[PDB]
């Protein structure tokens, strides 16, 4: 209360939130990716370099945020997984 900087009941579930949020983007991307080709026409055809630059640009930042999410949840999830468990038992050491 004194500081909402990070509530125990928050940072605790925070990780769990990252996981769900991680997968969310995992699928979301797959969801939008479908609209990419379906919207490709919006770029004036799907066989146009235009839509192409969008595809790569999509997958670009995509995997970028997807990976960052994984690597993030990889060290975050441990919050209530390892971090909580005990020191030295964090992914850092434990495979």
Partner 1 sequence: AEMKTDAATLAQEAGNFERISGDLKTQIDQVESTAGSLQGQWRGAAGTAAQAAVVRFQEAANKQKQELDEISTNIRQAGVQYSRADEEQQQALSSQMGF
Using the structure block, give the residue that is written with the tokens 């970028």.
Answer: 64
Q: How far apart are CA 40 and CA 32, in angstroms?
A: 12
b or e along 61-85 (b: 16 or more beta carbons within 10 Å of the residue's beta carbon)? ebeeebeebbebbebbbbbbbbbee
- 10-49 footprint of partner 1 as x/- string (CB under 8 A): xx--xx-xx--xx-xx--xx-xx--xx-xx-xxxxx----
Closest CA to 76 of 22, 3, 1: 22
Q: How far apart are CA 37 and CA 39, in angstroms?
A: 5
Subset of 47-86 contacting partner 1 (CB under 8 A) = 54, 57-58, 60-62, 64-65, 68-69, 71-72, 74-76, 78-79, 82-83
- 89 is an interface residue for partner 1 by CB under 8 A: no
* Positions in the binding site for partner 1 (CB under 8 A): 5-7, 10-11, 14-15, 17-18, 21-22, 24-25, 28-29, 31-32, 35-36, 38-39, 41-45, 54, 57-58, 60-62, 64-65, 68-69, 71-72, 74-76, 78-79, 82-83, 87, 90-92
């Amino acid at each position: 209360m004194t500081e909402q900087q990070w509530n125990f009941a928050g940072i605790e579930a925070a990780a769990s939130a990252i996981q769900g949020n991680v997968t969310s983007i995992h699928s979301l991307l797959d969801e939008g990716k479908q609209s990419l080709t379906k919207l490709a026409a919006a770029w004036g055809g799907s066989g146009s370099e235009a839509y192409q630059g969008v595809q790569q640009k999509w997958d670009a930042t995509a995997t970028e945020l997807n990976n960052a999410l994984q690597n993030l949840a990889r060290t975050i999830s441990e919050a209530g997984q390892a971090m909580a468990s005990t020191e030295g038992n964090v992914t850092g050491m434990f495979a």
